[PDB]
Symmetry: C5
Subunit: 201 residues, 5 copies
């Protein structure tokens, strides 16, 4: 039953241990679904956004036989390993608006979907034009290079109809960063939010 | 059995991280908002700042005790209990719980949690400064539990509403509804709360 | 018994999650506000930001010790004691506790907690800029314990900042109760009436 | 004895929740403010936002060790030590501690805590824009410990040259408060910050 | 040894509250700021709000393992590790850490911590609106560990192109503070940010 699955996850899950299988990186899939654009400052080039960060990976150490059991449970993220994802151009801490629970599937797949409100330093020039602003948000692992975490990406279906802004396009492009000190490459997703003020002349 | 024994027993049996589903039946969560205050409304950004009592009740039959010779209710910290992972889909701020985070547990295993919440929402503020007012829709449901695991059930709309708000309540309707994501067949149940209000 | 022994014994006997009801009786919680400052008033939104000392006392007789040859009082962190779940019904912010979260426990089992609280209320600010002033009513009771489990008992500008832009005309503290349609249970509150004005 | 042994001894003997009174004698807490910055002043609301180093020292002789062949000081998290429950009576914000919450424990049992605090006060800002300046009084004492348990014992060397304000004088005077109910006296330091706009 | 074994061993051996001094030598802390953004500048109050990457490295040799047949690096929560008690002497807000609080531990016992910090400083903003710009000096050192216990050593590539400011020059110079009372010297890095409005 659910209590047994959660008891077993709590005994075997190592929240502090990246679940690398053999020498393979953990494949972290990351998509933003934009829900709202709250505050835009064309002078300071800062945006306040709310997005669903759809995050999935496989931790095969969590797997169980579900032929005669539930094949999914909700688990507090404090009981699981979670990727140390960070937005490189964030200027506030991510504010998680929703309960900090992941779904764990019996094959060991983990789904985490926090609703995040966060402020970014990005190109706001053009927000009050027809072609709009393009704000680029770079999200990757802060401490795990490409041999440990790989980042995989997967338009306004969930965007508030009541925002003063409308979304023209969202592009999600794989990319990587390297710091001259070390040979290590860190994978990121570059998310390009092309948006503008509604109801211009 | 005295209060200390009831709380000792809850601490031994309660599994805060385990939904109390009885066989494969969903946990029936009842959710009502009582609006207490409307603090800030922005017609331009379509954002409201409200204070509401979220009356939340469910059954966790693993907590039940014989109360023929004991108290039939205790106050328990929610950190000792399983609580539904309810979230407002159109919230744009964290829920600010203004009150002590205690539930009442009844000897039949019923749990009552009534946080006073201050939160900001993105919703329709058009018409707020007119006679017929705005209608702001607040969608609250389980974030991670689909309809087979949690079912959400709604139940004098300004009985507790501050007479000192700049706004007044015309009507509150509470309608059952559900959300579904393209990927998956799973339905997540919500209550849609329709707050019809206006400037005084 | 020295201070370390009194604190060791409180830590063994205190159940922070268990209301200390003696022989089925409600716990008698005594609550007074002493207003220290009025920081921001908004006559348009009807909101006030205040600083007050919330003098709170009750009896937990399970904590009592023989003090004929011992200290008759210690300071204890409130995380080691049961504390009443008091809330202000018309608060629009969390209480911001400005002071160390310590109670005094007396050898007879009396507990004194006096947090300095900064909090915002929704209340009547009309008249603040007149001679007779505004009357802001702050309703404080137990959130979860009805009258058979907690009773709230009350007891003006002696400690009010001389440097506030406002001054206090009168504070009245009256017992009252709330009851919900659903249930016969009554929840006790103190209504505190702060009559103040701009200087 | 290495640092880990000194800290393991402190950790096993220190009772964070127990005031270290020797027999019936109060703990002598020494408190000085060193003003670092005056950030915001409001002559209408009479409110000041200040940054100060709160130099705090007392003795816990039960922690002492022989340091003839050992370090004579360690840094210890304050959560492992008893710390005086000091509060500013005219504070209108919670103290924002800007620095790591570590004390120094010296081998004779002296404890030194020097948090950098940013806090807002309700105090006399009248005269700030004049040559003789404002005098803002900050009362700091034990919140819960009367004079038989804690006694409190008391200018621009470190004041930011980039403040809009400058310090004319800091006075630190011992004082005490008493509540009508009870015979108990609570000791405080009154700190008088005489300052003005430059 | 796999990752789980190395992290289990670090968790068993780490002493978060014990400075890892090797022999009687100070711990060599290396500190560089990489400026990412300048958010708010106030030429009247002389206050700046900045975002920087604080590159911090030191050695804790007790954490070391044989990595000839193992991963030579893991990510560890800083709450499991000793971390230098670094503070900015002219900060006027708490450091706001924007990134996951994880360090890298290398098999030789080297620890790398790179928090992204947003913090407000009191410093010289005069000249920000001119061609030669302002020079804002940020002093960062150990708050509680003198020069015999911690030594601090320094060494627009990542600066946002979308700031309304631009960086002309960053200087990182070793320095020290001493308090008249005591012979103890506290080592700091003085970081000189020369910047201007675009
Ligand atoms: O967008 C989603 C998704 C979702 C949709 C598609 C793909 C993915 C995946 F992750 F695959 F990319 C996740 C979704 O599943 N939940 C339910 C959920 C949440 N947390 C954990 N488990 C389930 C919610 C709930 C609220 C809002 C958006 N939610
Ligand atoms: O600037 C850096 C560095 C870095 C670069 C040069 C020197 C040093 C050292 F440490 F040598 F000074 C560290 C870097 O390594 N990581 C990876 C990292 C993060 N946290 C902990 N350890 C490593 C990141 C990651 C994100 C942004 C900037 N990062
Ligand atoms: O609205 C309520 C209710 C209440 C009323 C009717 C239905 C429900 C239920 F929950 F049934 F829907 C709950 C109520 O009970 N408490 C007391 C309480 C609080 N928390 C926990 N248990 C009880 C309070 C207390 C303060 C303010 C509003 N309170
Ligand atoms: O008002 C008071 C009181 C006090 C005065 C009268 C009645 C009561 C009682 F509580 F009886 F109603 C308490 C007072 O006692 N302390 C000391 C104290 C503090 N906290 C805990 N215990 C004691 C302080 C300390 C600072 C400011 C105001 N304080
Ligand atoms: O002003 C001081 C002092 C100091 C100076 C004189 C008297 C006292 C005492 F406390 F004796 F009154 C303490 C000083 O020592 N430290 C080092 C220190 C820090 N924290 C804890 N212990 C020591 C610092 C560190 C930074 C800034 C100012 N610091």
């Amino acid at each position: 039953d659910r209590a047994d699955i959660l008891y077993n996850i709590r005994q075997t899950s190592r929240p502090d241990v990246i679940p690398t299988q053999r020498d393979r990186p953990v494949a972290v899939s990351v998509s933003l679904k934009f829900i709202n654009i709250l505050e835009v400052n064309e002078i300071t080039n800062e945006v306040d956004v709310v997005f669903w960060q759809r995050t999935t990976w496989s931790d095969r150490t969590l797997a169980w036989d579900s032929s005669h059991s539930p094949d999914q449970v909700s688990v507090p993220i404090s009981s699981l390993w979670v990727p140390d994802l960070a937005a490189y151009n964030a200027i506030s801490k991510p504010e998680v608006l929703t309960p900090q629970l992941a779904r764990v599937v019996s094959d060991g797949e983990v789904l985490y979907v926090p609703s995040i409100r966060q402020r970014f330093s990005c190109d706001v020039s053009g927000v009050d034009t027809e072609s709009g602003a393009t704000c680029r948000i770079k999200i990757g692992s802060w401490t795990h290079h490409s041999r440990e975490i790989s980042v995989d990406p997967t338009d306004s279906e969930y965007f508030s109809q009541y925002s003063r802004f409308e979304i023209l396009d969202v592009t999600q492009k794989k990319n990587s960063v390297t710091y001259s000190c070390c040979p290590e490459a860190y994978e990121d997703v570059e998310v390009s939010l092309n948006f503008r003020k509604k109801g211009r002349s």
